[PDB]
Design an enzyme around this catalytic site. Sequence first.
Site, PDB file in Angstrom:
ATOM      1  N   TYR A 283      18.458  -5.903  42.796  1.00 10.41           N
ATOM      2  CA  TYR A 283      19.262  -6.131  41.615  1.00 10.41           C
ATOM      3  C   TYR A 283      18.806  -7.404  40.914  1.00 10.41           C
ATOM      4  O   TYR A 283      18.604  -7.388  39.688  1.00 10.41           O
ATOM      5  CB  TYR A 283      20.727  -6.206  42.008  1.00 10.41           C
ATOM      6  CG  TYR A 283      21.218  -4.885  42.610  1.00 10.41           C
ATOM      7  CD1 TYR A 283      20.783  -3.646  42.160  1.00 10.41           C
ATOM      8  CD2 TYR A 283      22.106  -4.948  43.669  1.00 10.41           C
ATOM      9  CE1 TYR A 283      21.233  -2.492  42.782  1.00 10.41           C
ATOM     10  CE2 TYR A 283      22.558  -3.799  44.289  1.00 10.41           C
ATOM     11  CZ  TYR A 283      22.117  -2.577  43.851  1.00 10.41           C
ATOM     12  OH  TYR A 283      22.534  -1.448  44.549  1.00 10.41           O
TER      13      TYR A 283
ATOM     14  N   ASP B 152      18.596   4.810  51.462  1.00  7.76           N
ATOM     15  CA  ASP B 152      19.125   4.010  52.535  1.00  7.76           C
ATOM     16  C   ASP B 152      20.620   4.279  52.633  1.00  7.76           C
ATOM     17  O   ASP B 152      21.191   4.349  53.738  1.00  7.76           O
ATOM     18  CB  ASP B 152      18.926   2.542  52.289  1.00  7.76           C
ATOM     19  CG  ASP B 152      17.508   2.016  52.336  1.00  7.76           C
ATOM     20  OD1 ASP B 152      16.610   2.560  52.980  1.00  7.76           O
ATOM     21  OD2 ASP B 152      17.304   1.001  51.699  1.00  7.76           O
TER      22      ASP B 152
END
EC number: 1.17.4.1
Lengths: 340, 340
Positions: free
Chosen positions: A122, A237
Amino acid sequence: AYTTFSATKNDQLKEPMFFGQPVQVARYDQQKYDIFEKLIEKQLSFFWRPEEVDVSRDRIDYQALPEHEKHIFISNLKYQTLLDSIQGRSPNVALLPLISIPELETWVETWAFSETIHSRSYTHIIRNIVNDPSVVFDDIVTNEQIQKRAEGISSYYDELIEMTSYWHLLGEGTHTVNGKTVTVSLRELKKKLYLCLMSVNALEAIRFYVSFACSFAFAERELMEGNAKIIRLIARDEALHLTGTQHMLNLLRSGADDPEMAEIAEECKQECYDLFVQAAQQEKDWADYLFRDGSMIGLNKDILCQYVEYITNIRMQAVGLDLPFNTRSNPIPWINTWLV
Amino acid sequence: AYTTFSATKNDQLKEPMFFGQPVQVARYDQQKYDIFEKLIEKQLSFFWRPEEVDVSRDRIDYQALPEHEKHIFISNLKYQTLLDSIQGRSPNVALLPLISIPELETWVETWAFSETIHSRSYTHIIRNIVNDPSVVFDDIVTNEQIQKRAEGISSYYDELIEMTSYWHLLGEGTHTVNGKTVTVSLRELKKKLYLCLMSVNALEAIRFYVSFACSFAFAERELMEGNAKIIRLIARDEALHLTGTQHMLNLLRSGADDPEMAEIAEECKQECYDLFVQAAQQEKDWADYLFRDGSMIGLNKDILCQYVEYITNIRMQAVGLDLPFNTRSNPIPWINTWLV
Ligand SMILES: [Hg+2]
Ligand SMILES: [Hg+2]
Ligand SMILES: [Hg+2]
Ligand SMILES: [Hg+2]
Ligand SMILES: [Hg+2]
Ligand SMILES: [Hg+2]
Ligand SMILES: [Hg+2]
Ligand SMILES: [Hg+2]
Ligand SMILES: [Hg+2]
Ligand SMILES: [Hg+2]
Ligand SMILES: [Hg+2]
Ligand SMILES: [Hg+2]
Ligand SMILES: [Hg+2]
Ligand SMILES: [Mn+2]
Ligand SMILES: [Mn+2]
Ligand SMILES: [Mn+2]
Ligand SMILES: [Mn+2]
């Protein structure tokens, strides 16, 4: 209370997942439950680095975006960053002092570690598309609406951590702490952990999947492909993290682990139904802010509300609860091309 | 008073490393101390998996070793396993509730994760060389000789964890808990953290480095080469983890970070000096258990005790303590073929 190396030679195969003796030798030759071992292996196969994904063209694509869809993109990103910030530190601070088998202890530390990689991705995206990161990052803390759909996450973990410290310090009983009566009950602590787990399950299985669908809307229009490459990896994930809580919760329900956890799972079957309905409604309310200054061609609040229902019904079934919403086919089958 | 997401917008560049406000947003675009971001990046690029180093021929080599030498090999490995069992879990459970800046919070989680991969590599080695693993693993817990430090190392961590639970629950002052008085002092908690940080510095700086010399003496004779490839990659990692505790200690004593930590480091000077000479002594004593049944070519009790002295002087020097041993050159220069 808690020790970092307990001095009793114990059979780690006969410990419960949680609340038994603290793990002291970390061995991987044998496991009580091999799914946690499988997951550690799989997660390590998937080691990826955000910095190596090229997101340079997303500065131009973002720049070209209309202000209302620029607002959808960034609000979605700010919530993803809030959730992985909490998921980075919390499995380790809340669950790790309560584990008693080695394969779950290491899976938890591997799970919290892959969340810090998600946080790093991010930073990688924000730092490329926006000219000063700090207006994004300071807004996460202070945005009344982002905290509003997050309502309950930090509270569950914080109550758990506090209760655990009272049990570690004082043990079970009714105590006098500064002239107040405080009762520590392991049964109550066990349902606190169980509901925490059930909330983690809702977070990874529903809340991230709604945000992923908002992200890949843009990649379908061929915009923000660098961000879509990263989210595709994040999603792969989250699949594992979700599988993890689904089995933790289903083995606890089976009664094959601690028999009192089987008992608790039944007794609070209603709370478990009520937290998923709460989380579904929170994801729905957010749409009023997400499409606040304008909607998007393939993505509006009706499509978002139909997908939250759709995904909440799948997740609830996976853990044995009754479905709250009417059955429907996937409102956005294009997300299949991008997923997990 | 711990929270997994503090609601106060705060400038985390002005926060102390420890005992400030819990980190809430995980950001990696700016940092208060650049070294922890640099340690995360180096560690991520060093990622390896034990499974692709084959330790197959190490079985024949171990079986062919003279009995006393296999006692040295296996007893050294057992200690390496204990120390990484503690280090997988303990950075996370003891430091994470106390950190106030994001780059240190994610370095502690990355640091702890690379230790569990070290714990996975010791299972990979043992599985292959000693086809009944539980003999080795069950003896780490009970072994009298491995035990004295096990207890000492876990004690620092366990008292810090305990004092931290009292501090977050009750805050400072004099409290009564079931008839007893309990006094919580932030000053004392700060000393406790400092002595613990100093002890983790001794563990990675000295205790692991004495065991590396025992592993590479066999590789110098071209025995246990699979084990040697793996200790090479473990050692590479340890150099980073050691850099980390050195910088946290040196920034704390400089008074650059918290002025009260500078004072505490000054008062604690003679007991930090004593914790380090005690570590070196316990390493020196292990040699009489190791040369139990006899000695090896290239390493013996005397050369080994010289190395402990040498390495302790360098590590105490780096953290600005007075040198306890008489200065000398490196007794075993050959080891540099294996270390970073
Ligand atoms: Hg939880
Ligand atoms: Hg939770
Ligand atoms: Hg969406
Ligand atoms: Hg339930
Ligand atoms: Hg809806
Ligand atoms: Hg310590
Ligand atoms: Hg420590
Ligand atoms: Hg040694
Ligand atoms: Hg050796
Ligand atoms: Hg040695
Ligand atoms: Hg000290
Ligand atoms: Hg000192
Ligand atoms: Hg010391
Ligand atoms: Mn994540
Ligand atoms: Mn996750
Ligand atoms: Mn290690
Ligand atoms: Mn280490």
